[model samples]
Target chain A: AVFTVVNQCPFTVWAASVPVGGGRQLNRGESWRITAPAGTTAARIWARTGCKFDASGRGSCRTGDCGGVLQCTGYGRAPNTLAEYALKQFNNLDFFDISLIDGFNVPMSFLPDGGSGCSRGPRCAVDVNARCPAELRQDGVCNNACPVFKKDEYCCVGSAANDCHPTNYSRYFKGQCPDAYSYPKDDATSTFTCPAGTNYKVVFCP
Target chain B: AVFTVVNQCPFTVWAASVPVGGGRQLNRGESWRITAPAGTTAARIWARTGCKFDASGRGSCRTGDCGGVLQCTGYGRAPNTLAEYALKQFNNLDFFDISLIDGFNVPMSFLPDGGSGCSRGPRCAVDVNARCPAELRQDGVCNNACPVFKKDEYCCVGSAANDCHPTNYSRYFKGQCPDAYSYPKDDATSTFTCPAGTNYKVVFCP
Candidate 1:
């Protein structure tokens, strides 16, 4: 999300779901701005997006979710994947500044390991349509201020304490998402069935 | 698919889809084998799917599906993907013994791009499901293929070869698929409606 470039550096940083191969060139030390979906979290932002340098040395972010300028610290190399940059310990500094960077795009609405959807880790973006059983709590116990399902009981609340049970929610969602949680009303009433081949475990609330 | 490892190499190539990763290592001068799916043609094998690599240390391929084994002439380098061996360029006119490598294990299937299916192709493995249109002529014509038939005959089956007319059976199915290509038909019928927001184009045959 946020990128900074050193003067005369050859690399560029961008945001998008997949990496782009070729693009227009960039000026030395030039920065870029990108926008993600309104509710996009840092984890989801990193997952469904990427940026790269073009053959001509220009860089750009190719994403439907990206907007605004991104600061890229230009390095000699262009990174292709998020994992390629985040898993670095440069100069014993603990983080690699020369490669693609994170946290500059937007403030995270969901925690790195929070939110709903995805049975893996908290992703850079959330797809409400996608299945995310982890966010669902029995009877919507943690439901509070979501726009949809505003009845006597709330359904699908945030992943905060007394909110969705973070631990229980993340078990079935992205791990990088915050410890917050949510659940559907059916979790309390109906004998639900998970999709075939999927396993489930009970989450006890204190 | 079949793999033919020359003699004395450290590992044997298997008839399998190499997992997507950094690839494996092999002895400097060894032969390997790979069992490929039927109908494999001239194609490139890359370190990653949907991604291309140049002649540098990254991606490479050989002529013939060669059952995944790449023939090493001199002191070539190791392969970067499963079943593939990155051959070092041949050195001077010295003769080095080529032997079959053994004991390497690759996965039976590699995950396809977009969670689709994989096929041997132009470079590396291809995601045919992602490349091809979802809706195709199961029986060769769209009009007849449609449940709400507007005509008596389903697809253009009339014989007016070379001389094409609207009345020609082949003419009706012209832009659509010819009645030759085959697909899996056990669970679902080949006739399908393209999912919303996606477009469908028929693959014509001679």
Candidate 2:
């Protein structure tokens, strides 16, 4: 089915998608809809703010910059809010989520439409930029702890002791948006799913 | 205030708590209630299956074994579903979740009562043992990929490339229980929250 990408922010935002959908600049009230085949996996959609691109689609964004390109063919930089999903997974299920573990640049929401057995779709409408930690704060984005502190505890990697676990820094993000992921391993309450063949609506600055 | 832990499985389960509540055996249809002051962080509740402990509270469990002791002064072994939370976090918010990223031996749910803004509590009632992948299936539980693969991708640690992402194995868990975390970075839809001072209910096999 098709997934709708909407930009509700006052300023223009470059909506970027990984593995499909390409990129598009959407002013306020603009929306783009794209379709992925049934077996598409590891799909992600995000927004790039404070972008300055040329006619050739080569530019940079203050937040969620992807290789200084307007079209984010690959993943974006840190401090970008992410809407991730895998479609037509096992048992014909579609798993989707709004993740801040990478960081937060803009408010976002992921909504499933015309889908049965789908409830509590993820949303992060809170403005985390205002309260981002001093070390992780930027002009228009809030960085996750891992980017600020490269330690194993905050990064949730390295040795056995570094396996995914929550830290004080992550709790800060969770405190603001309970429905969004604050850090890696912050699952258990952040992932949502719907039956296969369901469409989705991803809104930025919702 | 207080957190209620219940065992709804058809067999006996060793209920283990971290930093508080200690450990206890709950037969089918039994429950244990414990209290923790506000500001308690990284608290966890889990079920141990096929346990045979001695009078000195020393024994082993087929799943979620904790140092061969009934009282889990530390964390448990793999293949155990976990209910993790932090009370009175930033802005007086309580964070809670049902984590299957560690693997699943029992169905679990974490509910908040008498709390405002507490919706979409975590729940994983599916019988994963019935559908666990052969490589991860155990006698009575399912093991996470990290234990078997020990790679940065599956474990979600190490370099930036391994920060937080899902693998094929985790997709299996996410497919079954969309609300529970199947991997460390699977937080977008897994972590839940409630106002501070709220009580919680952790139910196994729910």
Candidate 3:
């Protein structure tokens, strides 16, 4: 399968893919492409903001900083808008969603390149940074509740199990992008499945 | 102003109000009442789950456990669904919201008793525990992201200032309760305002 990462924002963004593709810097109106084999599981793509790297691709981002390196060897910092997918899984299906579970820094979207069938894809193009809460507000990124609150309620752990539910705090993202997964367990509506052999396109600031 | 706390769940819930209004255990379908003067700020109300009290009103709870006591002299533990409010302030308006920012344990709602002008109330009556993520799942409650992730993005501290935005995690709460504060900065939409002299009713599992 092939995936294209596009940067449509006015500023610079560091595009990253996990497990397979390395990281790359995308200027405004730039794009990068990655090809993966079938049956790729736990594949994820995201963008990092406020990065400063040297010629050797070693630096840090204010938001979505991935271990202070341009090539993200692992997951980035919190508040990064995420695009996750699994290709050619059971029954030859590809499941995907735009996740804010880690919090939000930039707007993003995922779409099928061609050959569409039950693959509506998902888009989260809202400028959440403009409406971010004061406590969670960053320089240019918006954060999730877990980092700020550091409680089981916001982190979804311990005694906050089955009794956990959404708060108005999360509505800011849901209200703007209903198609995205604003929280974990938002599967019913946030997750989308498509047939295999469908290439994907990931867009930032779409 | 007077505040009525009602329990609509099938089990017992210990109702507690911060600063004043000590605490009361309410069985299913029971209710408690509390009266406060004007200009009360930073006042909070919540429900304690899995409580075990002795004859002297001393005990602990599984969720929303406040200092392991029936009468919460201070804030409770995480995963406690919260009802926060401030009465009779600026422009003689009352500010109120149901907060899951600390996490969720039960369903709740807040409404004005009488006087309709600008009496906008908030409600969070969804059972979130059933859908909580495994990482954030607890015995009976559901935790938020900050506790689990503990990053600047989720916590909204350090770099995550003025730039914090909602994550998919927080959306779970917001999707269910459009009138409550899912996070700290969710003031624009989550917060409600009403004229002074308006009594309030807080219903659990409503």
Kindly give the stretch of ten consecutive residues in candidate 1 chain A with the minimal lDDT sum: A197-206
DockQ of each: 0.01, 0.01, 0.01
Chain A TM-score of each model, in the order shown?
0.20, 0.93, 0.92
**Which ten-residue region of model 3 chain A has the weakest summed lDDT?**
A112-121
For candidate 1, the docking band is incorrect
lDDT of 2 by residue, B1-206 (tens): 56767888999999999988788888987766666678889988999989998899986889888899888889998889999999988888898888887889898988874324355688898898888898898655788798777877877775634577777898999999998888888778887889885677798988
lDDT of each: 0.22, 0.82, 0.80
Candidate 1 displacement at residue B167 in angstroms = 49
Q: Residue-wise lDDT of candidate 1 within A75-183, one digit each (tens)?
A: 1121121221121123211111110111112112211111112132212233222343423321211111222234222333344323433234323322322222223
Q: How close is candidate 1 to the true structure, as a TM-score?
A: 0.20
B1-206: candidate 1 lDDT, tens digit per residue:
22222212233321112321122222322222232332332222221112223444343332112232333212222112222221112331111111111100111122111101222211112222222222422221121122223232332234422232233332222223222112111112111211111111110010
How many angstroms is residue A77 displaced in model 3 relative to the true structure, after the best TM-score fit? 74
Task: Assess candidate 3 and give its lDDT.
Answer: 0.80
Model 3 TM: 0.49
* Candidate that would win on TM-score: 2
On TM-score, who's better, 1 or 3? 3
What shift in Å separates residue B196 of candidate 3 from its native position after superposition? Answer: 1.1
Off-target runs (Cα >4 Å) in candidate 2 are A1-206, B115-117, B160-163
